[PDB]
Every structure is written in structure tokens, then in C-alpha cells.
Amino acid sequence: SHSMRYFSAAVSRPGRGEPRFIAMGYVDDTQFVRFDSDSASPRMEPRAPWVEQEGPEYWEEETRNTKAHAQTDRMNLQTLRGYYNQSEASSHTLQWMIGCDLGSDGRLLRGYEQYAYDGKDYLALNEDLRSWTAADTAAQISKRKCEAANVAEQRRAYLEGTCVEWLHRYLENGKEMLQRADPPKTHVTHHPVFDYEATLRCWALGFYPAEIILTWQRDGEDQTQDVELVETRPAGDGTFQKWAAVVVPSGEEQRYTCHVQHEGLPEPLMLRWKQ
């Protein structure tokens, strides 16, 4: 099940000069394009093998458009600064996101477009992609401005067409990377606390995509309430990691088994510590 997202962050820096603007695009958990106003040559550039091939017209348009986004959001930073009656010496952050999700069949299941100001939700396009939701009174101003401009149509047009269309294009160019799931290499570790207990840690390494289910069972049953679970983390090579732990009394290890569920596994494997 695939999706494509574009995110951006405009961070004002009074004194430091003009606002920094960075943007990037992803297909699933893979970044394929990046832009940074700070670069000696601000331009959208490839980050995934399956898009490096796109012609020069592509990069010229991707770049030209994103620079325009930068200019617009910089203008937005001061406009919102006006709405909230804020100092001109304080730093502020305007974040943007847009994206489309495809179903199993590859059709547009849901679209999105949202703005957040200084960490909080500001303006969002609703699920219907035909209306907006303001988070507060300032956003109500932006909302009316969006309605009076009938821009929703322009955004959903993008979400229903280009977004889905190009998502398919990328999914094919990188069929090997994007439509392939690497199963997690897994094992359990033992961590003795003197002689009265120990922690059993279950590892899932080098897998992709990131979605995964790790749980501990005692005599077949989820100890889900006493299980330690770390946020899934990037290994740095494109794959991910995750572990789950559970403190148990010495001499009760075998009563515990780790359940691992991943897209790249024929069937959820079951693990147990080996003495």
C-alpha cells in the first residue's frame, strides 16, 4: 500500500537574514527528493536512484516551483506574524505537508494538505478535499481567503491526478526498491540481573518497510502491558530496527516467545531464547 508526501519547513531567522526553507518528498519510507534554501545552489535534487533519471525539464520545474514555495511561505511567515501580533525579533516556524495515499488497487484512497504554525495545527484541507478547517481565529482568516479563492479545487485536482499519476511512475522506476519488502533478521537476547531476574529482548533488524508488530507472549498470551517497546528506528542504510523487552523471573524464560509480524514474512515467525 503506497503513498507519496511532500513536506516543507520555513524557519524565520531575524538578524540572521531571510527565512530558511527546506522541502523534501517521499514515496512510502523512502526520500527521493530534497531542497534547501541554504545550498550554494538552491535546487530540488535526487535522493533515490529511481528518480535520478528524470530529464532536465523535470528538475528545472521541480526546482522552479519549490523556490516559489519558499517565496510564498516567507511571505506567509510575516503575514501570520501579523495575525498573531508577534515580535519581529522572534523565530517562527511554518510547516507544510501534502500527500496522497493509494489503496491496494492503486487508486486514490485519501488526500491531504496541512499547515502548522510554531508547532500547532493551523489550516487543514478536509478529507473531502473540498473544504477547510481552521484551528483558531487567525486561521479562520486564511480559511476565508482560501474559500473566496476557490483554491480547494486546484489542490484536489493535484491530489487526484498528478499526485497519484507520478506516484505510479516512481513506483515502477524503483519497483525493486519500493515494491520489495526485506524481512527482519531477528533474535532474542538475555540480560541477567544478578540471580533473581532478567530481561528478554527481541530484535527485528534490517527490515523494510518500517511498519512492524513485535509482541511478547507468556505461555501464549500478550504481556503487552509490561513489555518495553522502543520507537522503530532507522539503521541508516535504508532498513529499520525495533526491539521489545520484558522482565522475567529467573527460570521462566521458556514460557516466553516473541511474535514478529512483517510484510516480508510468509508467516509471522515465533522466537524463543535458546539456552
Partner: peptide, 9 residues
């Protein structure tokens, strides 16, 4: 392919 413009808030 990225949408052409950002909304003028």
C-alpha cells in the same frame, strides 16, 4: 512531482 504553489495564507 510537486504541486506548483503553496497557499497564500
Amino acid at each position: 512531482r510537486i504541486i506548483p504553489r503553496h497557499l497564500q495564507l
